[PDB]
Design an enzyme around this catalytic site. Structure first.
Site, PDB file in Angstrom:
ATOM      1  N   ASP A   1      30.170  36.675  34.244  1.00  0.00           N
ATOM      2  CA  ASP A   1      31.270  36.984  33.319  1.00  0.00           C
ATOM      3  C   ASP A   1      30.653  37.420  31.973  1.00  0.00           C
ATOM      4  O   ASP A   1      29.713  38.232  32.021  1.00  0.00           O
ATOM      5  CB  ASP A   1      32.202  35.790  33.241  1.00  0.00           C
ATOM      6  CG  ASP A   1      33.009  35.580  34.517  1.00  0.00           C
ATOM      7  OD1 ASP A   1      33.199  36.498  35.342  1.00  0.00           O
ATOM      8  OD2 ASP A   1      33.326  34.342  34.706  1.00  0.00           O
TER       9      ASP A   1
ATOM     10  N   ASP B   1      39.043  40.705  46.033  1.00  0.00           N
ATOM     11  CA  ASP B   1      39.726  39.855  45.042  1.00  0.00           C
ATOM     12  C   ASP B   1      40.225  40.700  43.911  1.00  0.00           C
ATOM     13  O   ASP B   1      39.624  41.742  43.592  1.00  0.00           O
ATOM     14  CB  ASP B   1      38.736  38.757  44.504  1.00  0.00           C
ATOM     15  CG  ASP B   1      37.583  39.314  43.800  1.00  0.00           C
ATOM     16  OD1 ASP B   1      36.830  40.141  44.422  1.00  0.00           O
ATOM     17  OD2 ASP B   1      37.285  39.057  42.547  1.00  0.00           O
ATOM     18  N   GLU B   2      41.376  40.294  43.331  1.00  0.00           N
ATOM     19  CA  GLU B   2      41.789  40.770  41.992  1.00  0.00           C
ATOM     20  C   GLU B   2      41.968  42.268  41.910  1.00  0.00           C
ATOM     21  O   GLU B   2      41.736  42.863  40.858  1.00  0.00           O
ATOM     22  CB  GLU B   2      40.815  40.256  40.922  1.00  0.00           C
ATOM     23  CG  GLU B   2      40.847  38.761  40.776  1.00  0.00           C
ATOM     24  CD  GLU B   2      40.063  38.242  39.654  1.00  0.00           C
ATOM     25  OE1 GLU B   2      39.110  38.898  39.147  1.00  0.00           O
ATOM     26  OE2 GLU B   2      40.443  37.119  39.165  1.00  0.00           O
TER      27      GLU B   2
ATOM     28  N   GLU C   1      26.483  39.267  45.728  1.00  0.00           N
ATOM     29  CA  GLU C   1      27.088  40.485  45.208  1.00  0.00           C
ATOM     30  C   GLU C   1      26.179  41.168  44.235  1.00  0.00           C
ATOM     31  O   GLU C   1      25.787  40.599  43.257  1.00  0.00           O
ATOM     32  CB  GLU C   1      28.407  40.220  44.513  1.00  0.00           C
ATOM     33  CG  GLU C   1      29.155  41.476  44.056  1.00  0.00           C
ATOM     34  CD  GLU C   1      30.418  41.191  43.298  1.00  0.00           C
ATOM     35  OE1 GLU C   1      30.900  42.286  42.674  1.00  0.00           O
ATOM     36  OE2 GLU C   1      30.888  40.076  43.296  1.00  0.00           O
TER      37      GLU C   1
ATOM     38  N   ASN D   1      32.130  44.672  46.233  1.00  0.00           N
ATOM     39  CA  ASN D   1      33.517  44.266  46.113  1.00  0.00           C
ATOM     40  C   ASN D   1      34.367  45.572  46.118  1.00  0.00           C
ATOM     41  O   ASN D   1      33.992  46.558  45.508  1.00  0.00           O
ATOM     42  CB  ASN D   1      33.796  43.699  44.734  1.00  0.00           C
ATOM     43  CG  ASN D   1      35.056  42.889  44.702  1.00  0.00           C
ATOM     44  OD1 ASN D   1      35.972  42.867  45.541  1.00  0.00           O
ATOM     45  ND2 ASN D   1      35.088  42.038  43.697  1.00  0.00           N
TER      46      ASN D   1
ATOM     47  N   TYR E   1      32.810  26.378  40.833  1.00  0.00           N
ATOM     48  CA  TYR E   1      32.374  27.519  39.997  1.00  0.00           C
ATOM     49  C   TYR E   1      31.653  27.149  38.744  1.00  0.00           C
ATOM     50  O   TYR E   1      31.986  26.185  37.999  1.00  0.00           O
ATOM     51  CB  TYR E   1      33.660  28.261  39.510  1.00  0.00           C
ATOM     52  CG  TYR E   1      34.266  29.241  40.454  1.00  0.00           C
ATOM     53  CD1 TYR E   1      34.066  29.194  41.865  1.00  0.00           C
ATOM     54  CD2 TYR E   1      35.172  30.167  40.035  1.00  0.00           C
ATOM     55  CE1 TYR E   1      34.677  30.130  42.765  1.00  0.00           C
ATOM     56  CE2 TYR E   1      35.705  31.090  40.866  1.00  0.00           C
ATOM     57  CZ  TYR E   1      35.535  31.142  42.250  1.00  0.00           C
ATOM     58  OH  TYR E   1      35.967  32.116  43.105  1.00  0.00           O
TER      59      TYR E   1
ATOM     60  N   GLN F   1      26.605  43.605  37.847  1.00  0.00           N
ATOM     61  CA  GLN F   1      26.699  44.278  36.529  1.00  0.00           C
ATOM     62  C   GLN F   1      25.515  43.952  35.720  1.00  0.00           C
ATOM     63  O   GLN F   1      24.704  44.842  35.449  1.00  0.00           O
ATOM     64  CB  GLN F   1      28.016  43.987  35.804  1.00  0.00           C
ATOM     65  CG  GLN F   1      29.331  44.054  36.649  1.00  0.00           C
ATOM     66  CD  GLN F   1      30.524  44.192  35.784  1.00  0.00           C
ATOM     67  OE1 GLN F   1      30.538  44.937  34.814  1.00  0.00           O
ATOM     68  NE2 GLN F   1      31.532  43.462  36.129  1.00  0.00           N
TER      69      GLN F   1
END
Ligand SMILES: CC(=O)N[C@H]1CN[C@H](CO)[C@@H](O)[C@@H]1O[C@@H]1O[C@H](CO)[C@H](O)[C@H](O)[C@H]1O
Length: 634
Positions: A438, A291-292, A187, A230, A390, A161
């Site tokens: 994030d 994931d998620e 990613e 992803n 992380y 992103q």
């Protein structure tokens, strides 16, 4: 008076050495060192000697050591002397050294580096560089052989992103190499160009040429760069402009983050992306994330996936079956291209009609699929990607604490949530730290680089040596700081121009200037307009992760922020970091200006730049705006 004077030992071997002369530390530690008589000194006349085949490695080491030591170190072929560093590839030593291990012999024939592969020799040379760049040029004689306990050692780097600059990535790869880290899950978006995918060419993206260049660098350093797209969750950056492939809930509301796995055209779209990436990465793996998928909701809200599951996988099938079926179909797909699939552990759940394929590597980050111990029992291949390793720019729950892990006896068998498995499990691949953006305005990429230092050394040590030779974390820390960064990082020209007053014609549409440039602790500039007294910012435009990603967004003047402070000043982060600018020199001479957070480049808009964002809004022609470098490098 004391008479204090440098020792000034002759170059080469000496049978005489003090018994407790320091052996300079390395990271990873090289455990089981056997002491020999005497010591070896790098000095005038020392060469790096090798075969022809190792010439490039030898030349790069000589050049690097010349820089760290201030001694003219050249590379050579032929016979070695005791003054010399010798590099040897001996492929018969696979048992002792494996694919990545090395042996150092330090004694009267000089400093010998032996590996069984090109990468083993290279990894031995990283220890030589470490040992010699700490202001001591005399090394205690002896021998050691070392090889990594685990096969996969590294980081998740979500260059996702937001854009992590390619210069950052190059530095990161150099740091990984110094630390014998051989794995980066990247990613990232490779810019889609085909008629059927090109509407997803929103920023961040990387060009084919850019990826080719950093994969070639990586590969020369023994690093496997594994791409991730992803799916079927976290798909916003791919599906925003393809609502036809988005999954709708029972009420008809689509999420740009969810792929509709019941729609074969949506699935084909994902596979099309795989095929675009296949041309530029060299790895034998594909990571599809997984994931998620259902974060912020549940499968109960997507009855269509139950219907699909039943059609596809038979009466009784559940949405979890449809989900696992999608992963196994991607497994089939990449296997046919010669790749092995990797996923995140969390969507692996309770199935009825379908079972997850066992040839898929599970990267375990969340106590949420099975416990690890359950997965061990079923024979799955596992990589430890615990949340204890992380970092996030925004989520303060995620800051690696290397002191704590070192002191509390964490090892690579210590799965998320303190769930211990046999660290000798024969399908435990290794472990990794994870570097997640994030909400991305809280920290610049340069601040991330400062922050991750300790943790990268931690993971390096625990995945290669699996030992704690330093009595406490604090003893480790003292040596890792002595060792320092690799040469490429020390050489990177963060701030290529001096603070001062500048004319900047590219900025005339904002102000006639001139501009006052000051530098920041994280290697950026603040640019104050001397007309208005305000500072240039890249503040406004459509965002992802709270950073302006819009192609063609325009900068603006705003009240000047304090760019001298650290990342702990979270309350003013956005005004601060939107005022940071990265200045780069061309090969050769000319300077480009990039918003530090966005990593696009300021340019004068021609109106001929082509990008999906610009189909719907363009900056006024001839004004200054940000663009990805590929749209303005003509
Ligand atoms: C595997 C994983 O950790 N998934 C998410 C939850 N934890 C981290 C840290 O907060 C998140 O960043 C992970 O999501 C990832 O977010 C990024 C942006 O930061 C991308 O959207 C990824 O697709 C997503 O997996």
């Amino acid at each position: 008076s004391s008479g204090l004077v440098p020792r000034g030992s002759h170059m080469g071997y000496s049978a005489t050495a003090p018994v407790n002369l320091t052996r300079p530390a390395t990271v990873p530690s090289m455990d089981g060192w056997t002491d020999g008589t005497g010591a070896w000194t790098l000095g005038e006349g020392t060469r790096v000697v090798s075969s022809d085949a190792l010439a490039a490695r030898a030349q790069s080491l000589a050049s690097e050591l010349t820089k760290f030591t201030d001694v003219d170190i050249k590379a050579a072929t032929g016979s070695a002397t005791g003054k010399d560093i010798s590099l040897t590839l001996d492929a018969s030593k696979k048992a002792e050294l494996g694919d990545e291990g090395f042996k150092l012999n330090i004694g009267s024939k000089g400093l010998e580096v032996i590996g069984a592969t090109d990468i083993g020799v290279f990894y031995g040379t990283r220890s030589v560089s470490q040992m010699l760049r700490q202001g001591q040029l005399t090394l205690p004689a002896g021998t050691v052989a070392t090889k990594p306990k685990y096969k996969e050692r590294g980081a998740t780097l979500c260059a996702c992103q937001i854009n992590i600059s390619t210069d950052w990535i190059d530095r990161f790869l150099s740091d990984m190499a110094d630390l014998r880290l051989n794995y980066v899950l990247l990613e990232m978006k490779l810019k889609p160009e085909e008629d059927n995918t090109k509407k997803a060419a929103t920023w961040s993206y990387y060009t084919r040429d850019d990826v080719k260049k950093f994969v070639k660098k990586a590969n020369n350093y023994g690093i496997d760069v594994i791409p991730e797209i992803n799916s079927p969750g976290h798909m916003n950056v791919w599906l925003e402009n393809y609502p036809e492939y988005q999954l709708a809930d029972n009420s008809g509301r689509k999420d740009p983050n969810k792929l509709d796995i019941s729609n074969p055209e949506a699935v084909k779209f994902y596979k099309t992306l795989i095929d675009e990436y296949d041309g530029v990465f060299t790895t034998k793996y594909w990571h599809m994330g997984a994931d998620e998928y259902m974060i912020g909701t549940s499968f109960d809200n997507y009855s269509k996936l139950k219907t699909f599951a039943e059609k596809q996988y038979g009466a009784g099938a559940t949405p979890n079956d449809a989900f696992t079926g999608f992963i196994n179909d991607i497994d089939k797909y990449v296997k046919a291209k010669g790749k092995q699939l990797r996923i995140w552990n969390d969507g692996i759940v309770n199935t009825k009609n379908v079972s997850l394929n066992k040839d898929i590597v599970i990267e375990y980050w969340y106590g949420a699929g099975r416990k690890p111990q359950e997965l061990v029992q079923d024979g799955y291949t596992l990589m430890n990607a615990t949340q204890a390793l992380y970092w996030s720019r925004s989520a303060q729950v995620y800051k690696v604490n290397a002191a704590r892990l070192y002191n509390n006896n964490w090892n690579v068998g210590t799965f998320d949530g303190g769930r211990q498995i046999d660290k000798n499990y024969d399908k435990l691949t290794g472990a990794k730290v994870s570097i997640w953006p994030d909400s991305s305005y809280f920290q610049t990429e340069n601040e991330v680089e400062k922050e991750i230092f300790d943790g990268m050394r931690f993971i390096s040590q625990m995945t290669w040596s699996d030992s704690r030779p330093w009595a406490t974390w604090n003893d480790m820390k003292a040596d890792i700081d002595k060792i320092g960064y690799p040469l490429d990082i020390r050489e990177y020209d963060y701030t290529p121009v001096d603070a001062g007053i500048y004319d900047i014609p590219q900025l005339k549409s904002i102000s006639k200037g001139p501009w006052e440039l000051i530098t920041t602790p994280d290697g950026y500039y603040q640019m104050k307009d001397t007309v208005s007294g305000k500072c240039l910012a890249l503040f406004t435009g459509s965002k992802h992760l709270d950073v302006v990603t819009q192609v063609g967004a325009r900068p603006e003047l705003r009240n000047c922020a304090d760019v001298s402070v650290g990342q702990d000043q979270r309350n003013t982060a956005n005004e601060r970091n939107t005022q940071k600018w990265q200045i780069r020199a061309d090969k050769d001479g000319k300077y480009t200006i990039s918003p530090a957070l966005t990593q696009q480049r300021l340019a004068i808009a021609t109106g001929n730049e082509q990008n999906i964002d610009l189909e719907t809004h363009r900056p006024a022609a001839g004004t200054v705006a940000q663009f990805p470098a590929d749209l303005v490098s003509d």
